[PDB]
Amino acid sequence: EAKKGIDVILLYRVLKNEAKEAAWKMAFQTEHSNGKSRDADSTATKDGPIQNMAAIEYDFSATSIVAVGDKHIDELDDAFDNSELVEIWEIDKAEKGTDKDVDKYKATYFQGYVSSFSKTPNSEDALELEIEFAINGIGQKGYATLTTDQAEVVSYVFKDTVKVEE
Amino acid sequence: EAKKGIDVILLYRVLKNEAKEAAWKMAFQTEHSNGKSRDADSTATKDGPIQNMAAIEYDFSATSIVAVGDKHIDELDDAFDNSELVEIWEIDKAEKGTDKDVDKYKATYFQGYVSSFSKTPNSEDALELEIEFAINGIGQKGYATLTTDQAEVVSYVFKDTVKVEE
Amino acid sequence: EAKKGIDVILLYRVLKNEAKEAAWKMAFQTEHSNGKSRDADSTATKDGPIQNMAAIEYDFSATSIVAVGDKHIDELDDAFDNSELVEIWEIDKAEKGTDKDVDKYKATYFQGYVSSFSKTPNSEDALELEIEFAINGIGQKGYATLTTDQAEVVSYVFKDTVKVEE
Amino acid sequence: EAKKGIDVILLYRVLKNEAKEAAWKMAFQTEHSNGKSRDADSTATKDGPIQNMAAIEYDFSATSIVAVGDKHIDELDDAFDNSELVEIWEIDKAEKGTDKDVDKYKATYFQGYVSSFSKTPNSEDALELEIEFAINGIGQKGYATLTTDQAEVVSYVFKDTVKVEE
Amino acid sequence: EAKKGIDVILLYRVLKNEAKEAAWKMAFQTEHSNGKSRDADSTATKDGPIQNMAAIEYDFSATSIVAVGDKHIDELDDAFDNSELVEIWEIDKAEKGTDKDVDKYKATYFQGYVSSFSKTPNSEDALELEIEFAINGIGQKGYATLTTDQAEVVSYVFKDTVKVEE
Amino acid sequence: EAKKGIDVILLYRVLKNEAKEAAWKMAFQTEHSNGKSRDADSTATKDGPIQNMAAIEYDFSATSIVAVGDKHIDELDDAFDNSELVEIWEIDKAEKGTDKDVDKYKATYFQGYVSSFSKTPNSEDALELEIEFAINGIGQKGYATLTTDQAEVVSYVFKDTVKVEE
Fold this sequence. Notes:
6 copies of one chain form a homohexamer. In chain A, the strands form 2 sheets. In chain A, strands 1, 2, 3, 6, 7, 8, 9 and 10 form an 8-stranded antiparallel beta sheet that branches. In chain A, strands 4-5 form a two-stranded antiparallel sheet. The first copy, chain A, has one helix spanning 72-82, and strands at residues 8-14, 24-25, 29-37, 40-45, 48-53, 57-65, 86-96, 105-119, 128-135, 140-144. Helix content of chain A is 7%, strand content 47%. The longest helix of chain A is centred in the middle third of the chain and has 11 residues, at 72-82. The first copy, chain A, is mainly β. Chain A starts with 7 loop residues before the first strand and ends in a 22-residue tail after the last strand. Chain A has one domain: Pnp Oxidase, Chain A (Roll). Chains in contact: A-B, A-F, B-C, C-D, D-E, E-F.
């Protein structure tokens, strides 16, 4: 079968808080764009065309909906205003781990800076936040652990028609 | 829950009138765009890529509907024609203050110049005014006080079927 | 209340005809665009950013529907073909004058050249004329007088079912 | 009342056929664009801005539908392939002449070269021919004579239900 | 009456096969674009503007639907991969020949190279092939002969309700 | 008959795995773009225009839908991150082979690098993967063999209303 887009999520945390705080998940996800590209030029000589390949250039973006009572966005704003490194995780919820690493998910690890921070409030729409990152180097592949509270959704349960007595 | 866009408003006042006049709210708000960005360039050396970050560049805008009998817009036009500094406030109506600063809202403070002032009257639409600012330095985060008259809306009340006797 | 777009009109007259002819209103108005802007560049030094502002640049335009039996458009075309100065007024019909200037309206005064003159006739649409101006200097604010004939519209009156006897 | 776009037509003839052939009208007109513009630059000095106005630049275009059995288009093609001058007339059918020049129409006279000649045949649409001219100098205003056959349309007349006997 | 676009077709053949093969018509035609243009620049001198005209630049294109079992497209691909000259004909089916050249059509003759060859297969649409040519010199006007099989369409005929007995 | 777009498929395999692994078909195909072009410039001399043609430039692309449990995409990503050559085949399912090459299909063979690798997950759409290649030299024409499992589709078969007894 096909793989849905819902199963891919993102995590963040600041570099200097690696000892005090663990990873934290954004409140509301909408979408994100992860795309890498390379530059290919051709040099012509009398023996034939030769191709030299350039360095990897990353294009990263994220979109979310601002929640009320949220403190984490202020952390990202302060990290942008002070040029601090941000850790990014991209985790898949469909591919689980085998043998030695059961109950682990397939993930990639990046470190980069924040380069853009914009939001436009309208008169009839909810706030949307766009963040664009600049990544230092090639991302690495590995397996990561996702907690139970960060993977499951919350919905109401069945209740009877009897009083809710104090 | 989510945060609506109606909870964000703007205030203006001219720098040279800081002693005589307090802050004033524009009549009709439609939307505005607040976005900050940075430019990242890569320099290549034989040891690896190095990233240098540049100064912060701001992108600010405002949109409104002109009211009849309004004097404030003339003040902005005069300030634009004479290159005077304008103070800008962005206040949230959802995040209230704690302990020492109860009944205060989370706000951000700017100072900048006016750079654009345009309006296009049609034959069947109301006048709309678009203003663009140029900000000198990084905005500061703090708590601000909003008066009761500037936060509440006005609507008609219940009336009986009796006369309005003089 | 909101200000409608129908309350803003324009007047024209050529500079060399200031003694013989008074101001005249062009026949059919559709819309116009009045927008002023400035250029803000930043110079970087070791002590901090410095802001320098340049001269004001104007963006003016007009749109109309050509009337039959109209001579005034020929005057504008001849003024364009000979580089003559054209006076432009922008008058508001909603803001009336006080005390000494009762029955006067708020207006602005410009002098500029004609730089564009285009029209495209179709097979099922009426002719539309687009004019663009190049303004010499900053417009001045003042109060202007508008005649009764140029401010009111004309509609048919009630008639009986009796003949129109010669 | 307003002026419709139908009342404006165009005429052509080649310069070297001034004595042998009179003016000829295109078969099917759809639309055309006549627009003139000027370039305005500003030079800054210590005494104030100075404006120098440039030469007039013309923008001309025509659109038509190719008719079957038409020879005139080949004349335009040969004139384009050999760089010959083409005379263009733009005549209004609503403004008639007075006293000395009764039964004459208001017209403008141009001479220019042909610079573009394109057509794109589809599988379900009729052929359309697009021509773009380049005009040598300023057009002149005058009155021109239009023949009766070139101004009136042709429609069927009433016929009885009797035979059409040879 | 008007001229439809279905009456214009194209023919091809390779230059080196002028003795062994005659002209061949492409299987399915959709549309094509034939447009010629010139560049006009103005040089200013103290006596007046002077206009100089440059060489003719051609813009040619073709669109078709690939047929199954077709060998001709491979010939065009081979000619493109080896830089061979291609002959192009554009023939009208509405203008027939007179006196000496009865049963001949009005045509135009070109010789050029192939410069583009692209096709994009989708999941629910038929294949479409787009070819662009680069023409060496001015096309020549003349009369050409079209065979009976290349001008008529094929449709089913009437059949009775009796068997198709062997 | 017309040729549908479903009859064209692609195959991949890495150059360094030519001995251990055979060709493999990627799971879900949507579309792809194969386009080749050349650059034609004209040099002017006193004897006439001369045409010079440059090297062939390729434009290749692919689009697909990511499947769950798929390992092959990781191979392409690793080949991109390490600059390895990738073999590409384009096979037609409508043109079968003759005499000595019965049950073979018409195909083309390319070798190139991976230059782009992007994917954007949404909240209500399936993942789509876009890949762009950079080809070294001109593709070669030949006949290739396609296995039975890679050419046929799979659908359910008829079942009775009796149980599925163990």
